[PDB]
Amino acid sequence: RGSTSEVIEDEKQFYSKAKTYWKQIPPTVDGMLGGYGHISSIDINSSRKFLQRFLRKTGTSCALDCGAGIGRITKRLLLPLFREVDMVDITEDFLVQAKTYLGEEGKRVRNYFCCGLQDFTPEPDSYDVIWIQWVIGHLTDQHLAEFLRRCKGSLRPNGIIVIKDNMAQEGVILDDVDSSVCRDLDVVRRIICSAGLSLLAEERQENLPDEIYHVYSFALR
Amino acid sequence: RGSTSEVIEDEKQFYSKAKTYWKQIPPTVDGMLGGYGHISSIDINSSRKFLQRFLRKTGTSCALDCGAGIGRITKRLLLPLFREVDMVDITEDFLVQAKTYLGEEGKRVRNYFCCGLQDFTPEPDSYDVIWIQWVIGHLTDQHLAEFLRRCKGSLRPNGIIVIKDNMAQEGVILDDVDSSVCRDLDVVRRIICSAGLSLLAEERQENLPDEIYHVYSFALR
Numbered sequence: 031r032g033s034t035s036e037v038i039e040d041e042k043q044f045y046s047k048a049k050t051y052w053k054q055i056p057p058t059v060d061g062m063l064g065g066y067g068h069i070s071s072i073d074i075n076s077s078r079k080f081l082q083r084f085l086r087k088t089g090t091s092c093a094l095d096c097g098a099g100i101g102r103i104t105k106r107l108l109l110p111l112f113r114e115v116d117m118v119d120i121t122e123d124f125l126v127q128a129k130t131y132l133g134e135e136g137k138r139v140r141n142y143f144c145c146g147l148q149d150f151t152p153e154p155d156s157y158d159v160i161w162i163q164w165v166i167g168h169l170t171d172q173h174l175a176e177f178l179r180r181c182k183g184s185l186r187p188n189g190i191i192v193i194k195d196n197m198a199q200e201g202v203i204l205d206d207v208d209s210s211v212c213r214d215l216d217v218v219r220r221i222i223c224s225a226g227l228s229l230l231a232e233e234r235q236e237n238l239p240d241e242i243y244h245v246y247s248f249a250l251r
Numbered sequence: 252r253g254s255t256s257e258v259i260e261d262e263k264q265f266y267s268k269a270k271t272y273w274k275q276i277p278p279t280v281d282g283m284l285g286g287y288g289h290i291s292s293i294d295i296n297s298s299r300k301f302l303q304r305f306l307r308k309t310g311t312s313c314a315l316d317c318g319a320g321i322g323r324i325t326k327r328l329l330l331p332l333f334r335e336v337d338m339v340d341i342t343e344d345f346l347v348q349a350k351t352y353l354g355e356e357g358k359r360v361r362n363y364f365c366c367g368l369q370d371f372t373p374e375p376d377s378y379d380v381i382w383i384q385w386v387i388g389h390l391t392d393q394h395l396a397e398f399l400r401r402c403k404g405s406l407r408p409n410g411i412i413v414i415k416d417n418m419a420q421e422g423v424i425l426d427d428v429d430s431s432v433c434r435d436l437d438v439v440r441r442i443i444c445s446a447g448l449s450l451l452a453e454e455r456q457e458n459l460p461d462e463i464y465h466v467y468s469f470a471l472r
């Protein structure tokens with residue numbers, strides 16, 4: 031199976047089941063990472079090193095955290111590097127928790143957008159960095175392509191989009207646990223290319239548990 | 252006479268004669284406006300003010316210019332305000348000219364649809380604004396109602412349809428020059444309500460030559 035259209039039986043249910051799954055997840059780092067909270071530091075440090083290359087130039091004024099959850103990434107990666115951050119997530123309870131989780135530094139979160147990425151239009155020329163981590167599997171192929179194009183139109187000069195996510199060994203696979211798909215590297219690269227985005231960097235995440243999907247970062251604009 | 256069914260003798264001929272009329276019209280603003288090219292600025296400027304009331308919320312991703320001709324409206328009203336525009340018109344030569352007329356900004360016209368509105372089905376979830384100007388008189392009452400129902404089905408959330416057109420003092424009047432009708436305000440309102448639309452705003456156009464039909468704008472959803 032090479033596309034979401036093949037594997038998703040009913041698009042409305044694909045989205046509503048995902049919302050229902052996330053509604054019952056603890057609003058904690060462990061919850062955000064599916065019981066793998068302990069990998070957060072290795073993930074964040076690797077993400078920082080990847081992002082720092084572009085800030086040696088990409089601007090430091092504003093970032094957008096997509097599928098931000100309670101703000102694991104906003105706390106440790108984005109807020110230390112960007113003067114302001116916007117967060118978008120489908121799960122209201124996570125964004126409410128974010129306000130506590132993020133503490134004093136979280137007062138620099140400008141907008142908390144409670145919204146599906148498939149329904150979200152980032153404002154034109156607004157963001158230096160748009161971070162999209164462990165959420166692309168929650169969108170259809172068409173919605174992903176379209177969102178990426180809207181993201182591109184939301185970038186400031188020299189701004190970048192970063193996708194960081196699990197890659198499948200082959201094809202497109204439905205996870206009926208959380209109502210998401212996982213796609214292989216070639217599938218993801220094709221969707222990016224078809225969105226008219228340039229691939230500025232690609233990097234496999236190392237030092238990771240073996241029984242979980244491989245993780246790639248892609249910087250785009 | 253209170254309906255097109257009481258004035259149009261042969262429906263096929265009503266459509267074919269209009270197509271023939273438009274085929275021999277020069278592809279210019281003066282041709283679009285039947286010799287009143289000079290009213291274009293007062294018209295466009297009034298349309299902009301009318302529409303901006305909804306943009307200040309109706310989205311700005313995409314518009315549909317119905318009976319667009321060479322793109323008089325697409326050029327001055329829609330392309331500046333909307334990220335993409337689709338054009339639909341029965342007259343192939345006008346849409347060809349449009350590619351020249353629109354120039355550089357015209358590169359952001361997504362689709363050129365050569366089709367009668369009576370045969371056109373805008374696809375679900377496509378448009379923030381559907382603009383229908385100086386063309387409703389080319390459709391029968393039933394095709395008009397059905398088209399407007401189709402349009403409603405294609406609107407994005409908060410999206411609107413705008414009709415801007417000549418209104419007759421009374422009844423339904425046939426123009427056997429261009430093979431169109433003009434309908435009074437009551438007739439037009441009846442057709443709107445029957446299409447399951449709500450009236451959002453109505454505005455009479457000011458500063459027009461006294462010898463031409465009154466013009467009204469209706470915003471609908």
Ligand SMILES: Nc1ncnc2c1ncn2[C@@H]1O[C@H](CSCC[C@H](N)C(=O)O)[C@@H](O)[C@H]1O
Nearest residue numbers: 052062097099102119120121146147163168
């Ligand atoms: N369609 C959708 N649009 C926006 N957010 C979604 C979504 N589907 C799932 N989500 C959110 O995606 C997140 C995935 S868990 C990952 C959280 C965060 N990116 C991190 O790495 O820490 C959850 O917060 C869930 O609520």
Ligand SMILES: Nc1ncnc2c1ncn2[C@@H]1O[C@H](CSCC[C@H](N)C(=O)O)[C@@H](O)[C@H]1O
Nearest residue numbers: 273283318320323340341342367368384389
């Ligand atoms: N049935 C029909 N479906 C779609 N377009 C039609 C049509 N009958 C006539 N037209 C088109 O309607 C237009 C009317 S002239 C007005 C053009 C444009 N709305 C403007 O205001 O500048 C012409 O371009 C003509 O080709």
